[PDB]
Every structure is written in structure tokens, then in C-alpha cells.
Design a protein around this nucleic acid. Structure first.
Ligand code: MG
Ligand code: ZN
Length: 134
DNA sequence: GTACCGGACGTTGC
DNA sequence: GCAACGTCCGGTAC
């Protein structure tokens, strides 16, 4: 399908085959009207190791939106197992208040473990901010 | 190499 | 109310 982001109607872009590391592409709209994109990769150092979803594509996207003050965003990833239950329950925490970010798993995704979902999830950030690690 | 630990948030089962 | 459970993660004990 095609998802709306401001005035744009964007579909899923080409992503590398899932090798074991989840790679994703994140789209937003700049303070002018143009469409910008950034690639996020699983792993890497995170400022919140106390949140199990901070190392994921959805968590890195949420933290990016919080840092750069982005209100709307749209991310596509390539993980066939879907979006983990952590990213389901803690994204709105990580996300700044009233920020809208939809996470689109690859089409045809099949969850395996508990909490993982294969459908699109539209998160709405809550007034809660992430707890400091120390 | 395998096997756990662990913060943290909401869900499910009891 | 409480126990298990969820990583795309590192880190620690065998
Ligand atoms: Mg929040
Ligand atoms: Zn996740």
C-alpha cells in the first residue's frame, strides 16, 4: 500500500535482504516542504540501553524525531518477524508528546514470538519522556 | 561458542 | 494484584 506523509503518498522503498540486521528507511518533511529520508541500522550505540527498543529501527527513528523536533514520520523496515513487542509498548514513551510516527513492516511479514506484529502500527507519542540510564 | 541478565512498558493468563 | 514475556542489544559467566 501507500502511506500519507503531509502532502506526499510514499510506498515502501527497496531494502537489502534481511541478513540478521534490521535496516530501515525513515521519511519526514523539512521546514520548507521537501521530503527527506534517512537510513537507520539495527544495533549501534544508543543513549538509552535501559530501553530494549532503543537499538531498533523504530526506536532510533523515534529518538531522531525527538532530537530534531519532528512531528510526523514514516519508517519502513525489512525484518520478516515484524515489529517487536518492546517497540510496540515503549515507542510512544520514547516518542515526544503528540508526535505521529507509523512503522510499516515488510509486506507479508509473519511474527514468530510474543508481542511481534506483522501489521502497520501508528504510534502517538505520550507526555512521558524516556528515563535517564543513570 | 552457548546461556543467561537486565531495564523497562504494556499485554495476557491466573 | 502477580508471574511470563516479548531484541533489530550488548555484557558477563561457563
Ligand atoms: Mg512519550
Ligand atoms: Zn523492536
Amino acid at each position: 500500500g501507500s502511506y500519507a506523509l503531509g502532502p506526499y503518498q510514499i510506498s515502501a522503498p527497496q531494502l537489502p535482504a534481511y541478513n540478521g540486521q534490521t535496516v530501515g528507511t525513515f521519511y519526514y518533511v523539512n521546514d520548507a516542504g521537501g521530503l527527506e529520508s534517512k537510513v537507520f541500522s539495527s544495533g549501534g550505540p544508543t543513549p538509552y540501553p535501559n530501553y530494549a527498543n532503543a537499538g531498533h529501527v523504530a526506536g532510533q527513528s523515534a529518538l531522531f524525531m525527538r532530537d530534531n523536533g519532528i512531528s510526523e514520520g514514516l519508517v519502513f523496515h525489512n525484518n520478516p518477524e515484524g515489529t517487536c513487542g518492546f517497540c510496540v509498548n515503549m515507542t510512544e514513551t520514547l516518542l515526544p508528546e503528540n508526535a505521529k510516527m507509523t512503522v510499516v513492516p515488510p509486506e507479508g511479514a509473519i511474527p514468530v514470538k510474543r508481542g511481534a506484529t506483522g501489521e502497520t502500527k501508528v504510534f502517538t507519542g505520550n507526555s512521558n519522556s524516556p528515563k535517564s540510564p543513570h
